Amino acid sequence: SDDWEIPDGQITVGQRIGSGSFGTVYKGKWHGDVAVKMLNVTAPTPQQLQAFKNEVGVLRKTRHVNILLFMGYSTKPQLAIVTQWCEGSSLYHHLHASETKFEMKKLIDIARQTARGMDYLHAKSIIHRDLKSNNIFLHEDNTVKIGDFGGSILWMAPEVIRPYSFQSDVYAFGIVLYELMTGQLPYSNINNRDQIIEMVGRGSLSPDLSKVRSNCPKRMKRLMAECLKKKRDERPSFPRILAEIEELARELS
Amino acid sequence: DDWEIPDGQITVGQRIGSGSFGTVYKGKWHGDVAVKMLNVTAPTPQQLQAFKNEVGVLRKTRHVNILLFMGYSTKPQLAIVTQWCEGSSLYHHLHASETKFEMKKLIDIARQTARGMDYLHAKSIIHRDLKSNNIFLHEDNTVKIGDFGLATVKSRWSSHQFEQLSGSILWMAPEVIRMQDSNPYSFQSDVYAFGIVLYELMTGQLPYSNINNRDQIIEMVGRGSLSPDLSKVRSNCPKRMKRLMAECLKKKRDERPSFPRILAEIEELARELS
Ligand SMILES: CCn1nc(C#Cc2c(C)ccc3c(Nc4ccc(Cl)cc4)nccc23)c2c(N)ncnc21
Ligand SMILES: CCn1nc(C#Cc2c(C)ccc3c(Nc4ccc(Cl)cc4)nccc23)c2c(N)ncnc21
């Protein structure tokens, strides 16, 4: 992978879609529909430039169906990152902001695609911090795309509260399994935001697994409980997680 | 030495078929993938050079309408890995399954193919042998462009050992047919191939159904007397679509529009019917 810079003037920026991890995200026209994440500043700060370079160097190493397709970047007009245009909404929107009623097979398949993406990233020695249902996009409502999109304490691990590792990502994936199988956020009953942080970091608070659906598979619930282990080094690696999820899904096709 | 996949990470599965070189299987590597490997003990200079050329061309592509290259392996054997797509080729849907899409779907397939081809032309990549067999319908909704078929190889002793690119003679342009010199292919020949694809999309059949002899097609098209019958287009086919298809099928090489203009026309057409 080399020479991925897009010259200025080739992209036609369109409607502003919102604010991303840094800068603003628009929909652009460049050999089809694309998404442009730009930094609307005249001169970027050292922090901004280093974050841009790190994110671009991480994106140029990814070629997987369940990872958002990086396509190029621009620096001459301003810092910009170009990705594929996806049709659909984030998993958080489907679960907690919309009334979409998925099938259990669809939930299992979403979990499997997310596990595939995360195992791919871990194979590249890439720790994805701030993993949540907002960061899992449903392309055409059928394909999972993982990315760092633009409150995230719900997925935070006890160690991160007190430093990021693969095990924190496994715990975040466990929380994702929780919101997939139950349908709601982990601690709805707890209302004080600061209380949740201290309680979970201390270790007294943990998700209520009675919220899982009756048709939720046994092995799926057991794996979700194993991924949400309070101890950092008690959680399985993502190869075993993907293997269990694939063995579960492959018996329903 | 980047993008190399270590040995043992991929679990090769059911043989899916024969690719451009070697054999193509479905494999397990962080999910479902497709592996095109060369089942030889020691590769020849030609085989290794072809592998390296294809890998170097694939490593420059990151587009939704181009088949996603994922990596390669060399320790067990020369192999190229791409994403696993569910569905069938456009040729299968049109002439082997006779699936009747809606006009919107035909327009959208043409639009996605135009996106992919304009992307490739922007990278100075001339994709020869563009046809409906080389256009895969991932989930029957997304276009993926790739080199799935075989090339034409003349038999050393008599008339053809390989003839799949002679199967693509239907999509060959008159200039490519005539002289067959060192690379008669151009961006305009790809434009003509895309025009033939538009023809089989809007009519539903191959350009020369009544003519069966390949030599007749060669002589007639190269001479300049033969061209697809555009009366076979459907009545609901847009006028602009037929006009663009006729402009892409111009007998002269330098009378056909470039793929930026083609993609612009197709996108402006599609955005007026949604
Ligand atoms: C609803 C609003 N919305 N936002 C879109 C976007 C975007 C992004 C852009 C432009 C650039 C970088 C991103 C990125 N970086 C990244 C870093 C590390 C790794 Cl491993 C993976 C990804 N993560 C996530 C997203 C982007 C978007 C779209 N593409 N289609 C439809 N709606 C969309
Ligand atoms: C018929 C059954 N079949 N065959 C699949 C495959 C494959 C390929 C592999 C493994 C490697 C290289 C390819 C390639 N090279 C290439 C060169 C230049 C350019 Cl620009 C673009 C592509 N062109 C086409 C395909 C492959 C396949 C799949 N991925 N999913 C489902 N069914 C499938």
Side-chain angles (χ1 to χ4, degrees), chain A residues 1 4-7 9-14 17-28 30-60 62-75 77-98 100 102-104 106-141 143-155 157-161 163-183 185-189 194 196-197 200-201 203-212 214-218 220 223-228 232-233 235-239 241-243 245-246 249 252-253, chain B residues 2-13 15-45 48 50-59 61-74 76-99 101 103 106-128 130-153 155-157 159-160 162 166-213 215-219 221-222 224-238 240-249 253-274:
Chain A
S1 62
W4 288 114
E5 168 156 33
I6 303 185
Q10 298 200 7
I11 304 182
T12 300
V13 296
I17 314 167
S19 297
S21 58
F22 69 90
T24 49
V25 176
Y26 313 80
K27 171 166 175 192
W30 184 72
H31 309 105
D33 304 326
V34 310
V36 185
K37 178 213 282 182
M38 280 173 166
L39 182 56
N40 285 130
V41 301
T42 48
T45 72
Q47 189 65 71
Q48 290 170 348
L49 186 66
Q50 199 164 61
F52 164 84
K53 279 187 178 184
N54 288 350
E55 176 167 1
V56 164
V58 170
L59 274 175
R60 70 182 299 154
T62 64
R63 290 177 184 263
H64 189 268
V65 190
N66 296 115
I67 304 302
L68 186 69
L69 182 69
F70 163 78
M71 290 191 312
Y73 68 91
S74 293
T75 57
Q78 47 190 3
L79 297 178
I81 302 177
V82 189
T83 59
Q84 59 172 143
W85 176 253
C86 293
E87 219 68 46
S89 302
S90 67
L91 178 66
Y92 184 91
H93 181 68
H94 284 263
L95 263 43
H96 321 106
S98 303
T100 55
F102 292 97
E103 308 294 322
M104 179 53 62
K106 191 97 168 184
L107 302 179
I108 301 305
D109 195 18
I110 290 176
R112 184 172 70 175
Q113 300 190 34
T114 313
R116 295 178 172 183
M118 294 300 304
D119 192 27
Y120 181 84
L121 293 179
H122 282 22
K124 315 284 289 197
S125 300
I126 297 181
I127 305 176
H128 175 221
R129 311 142 212 258
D130 204 294
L131 170 69
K132 41 189 187 188
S133 54
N134 177 37
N135 284 348
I136 302 173
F137 199 96
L138 297 178
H139 179 51
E140 293 200 326
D141 306 351
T143 302
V144 159
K145 300 284 176 165
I146 293 182
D148 183 21
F149 293 85
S152 180
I153 62 175
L154 291 182
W155 295 260
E159 49 275 4
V160 315
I161 291 295
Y164 292 95
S165 64
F166 295 149
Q167 296 84 352
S168 57
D169 295 8
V170 167
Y171 181 85
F173 181 80
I175 301 279
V176 174
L177 290 175
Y178 186 89
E179 46 182 359
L180 282 167
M181 297 312 151
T182 69
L185 296 180
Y187 319 116
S188 67
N189 44 37
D194 222 339
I196 292 182
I197 301 181
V200 172
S204 174
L205 189 46
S206 63
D208 192 341
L209 302 181
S210 68
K211 310 286 179 178
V212 303
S214 306
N215 61 340
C216 177
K218 13 76 188 58
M220 181 60 61
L223 177 79
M224 177 206 308
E226 289 173 9
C227 293
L228 297 178
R232 183 178 83 161
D233 296 312
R235 322 192 237 268
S237 64
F238 254 107
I241 301 168
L242 176 57
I245 298 188
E246 289 238 0
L252 279 75
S253 50
Chain B
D2 201 0
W3 289 115
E4 170 156 33
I5 303 185
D7 205 338
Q9 298 200 7
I10 304 182
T11 300
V12 200
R15 172 189 174 274
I16 313 298
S18 297
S20 57
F21 69 90
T23 315
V24 176
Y25 311 79
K26 171 166 175 192
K28 309 297 297 182
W29 184 73
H30 311 290
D32 304 325
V33 307
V35 185
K36 178 214 282 182
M37 57 173 55
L38 182 56
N39 284 321
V40 301
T41 48
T44 71
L48 188 153
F51 164 83
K52 277 262 153 278
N53 288 349
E54 177 167 1
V55 164
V57 170
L58 275 175
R59 70 184 299 154
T61 64
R62 289 177 183 263
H63 189 268
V64 191
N65 296 115
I66 304 302
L67 185 69
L68 182 69
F69 164 78
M70 289 190 169
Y72 68 92
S73 60
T74 56
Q77 271 157 351
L78 296 177
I80 302 177
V81 188
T82 59
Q83 59 172 143
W84 177 255
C85 293
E86 302 282 20
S88 303
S89 67
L90 178 66
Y91 184 91
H92 180 279
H93 285 97
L94 263 43
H95 321 106
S97 178
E98 299 211 357
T99 305
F101 292 98
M103 179 53 63
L106 301 179
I107 301 305
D108 195 61
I109 290 176
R111 184 173 175 185
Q112 300 189 34
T113 313
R115 295 179 171 184
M117 293 300 304
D118 192 27
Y119 181 84
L120 293 179
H121 283 201
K123 314 284 290 197
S124 300
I125 296 181
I126 304 176
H127 176 18
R128 309 144 271 194
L130 170 70
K131 40 189 186 188
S132 54
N133 302 269
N134 284 347
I135 302 173
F136 197 97
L137 297 178
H138 180 51
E139 293 199 325
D140 306 351
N141 299 336
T142 302
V143 160
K144 303 284 176 165
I145 293 182
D147 182 21
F148 294 96
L150 300 159
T152 280
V153 180
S155 62
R156 169 77 190 200
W157 312 108
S159 176
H160 285 274
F162 263 177
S166 181
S168 74
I169 271 176
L170 238 46
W171 295 261
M172 287 188 184
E175 48 275 3
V176 176
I177 291 179
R178 287 160 201 170
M179 39 218 63
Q180 190 67 50
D181 63 343
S182 86
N183 188 10
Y185 293 94
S186 64
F187 297 116
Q188 296 84 352
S189 58
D190 295 8
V191 166
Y192 180 86
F194 181 80
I196 301 279
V197 174
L198 290 175
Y199 185 88
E200 46 182 359
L201 282 167
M202 296 311 151
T203 69
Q205 42 183 340
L206 296 180
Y208 320 116
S209 304
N210 44 37
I211 301 158
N212 294 325
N213 179 249
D215 292 324
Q216 293 180 13
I217 291 182
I218 299 181
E219 172 68 19
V221 172
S225 56
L226 189 47
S227 63
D229 191 342
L230 302 99
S231 301
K232 309 286 179 179
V233 303
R234 300 180 179 88
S235 306
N236 61 340
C237 177
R240 317 147 90 172
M241 250 301 177
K242 193 177 182 180
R243 301 187 189 101
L244 177 80
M245 178 205 308
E247 289 172 9
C248 293
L249 297 179
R253 183 177 82 162
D254 295 312
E255 288 180 5
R256 320 192 275 262
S258 63
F259 253 108
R261 205 145 50 257
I262 301 168
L263 176 57
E265 260 280 326
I266 298 188
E267 195 119 0
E268 197 198 82
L269 207 172
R271 283 183 122 260
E272 279 193 2
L273 279 75
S274 50

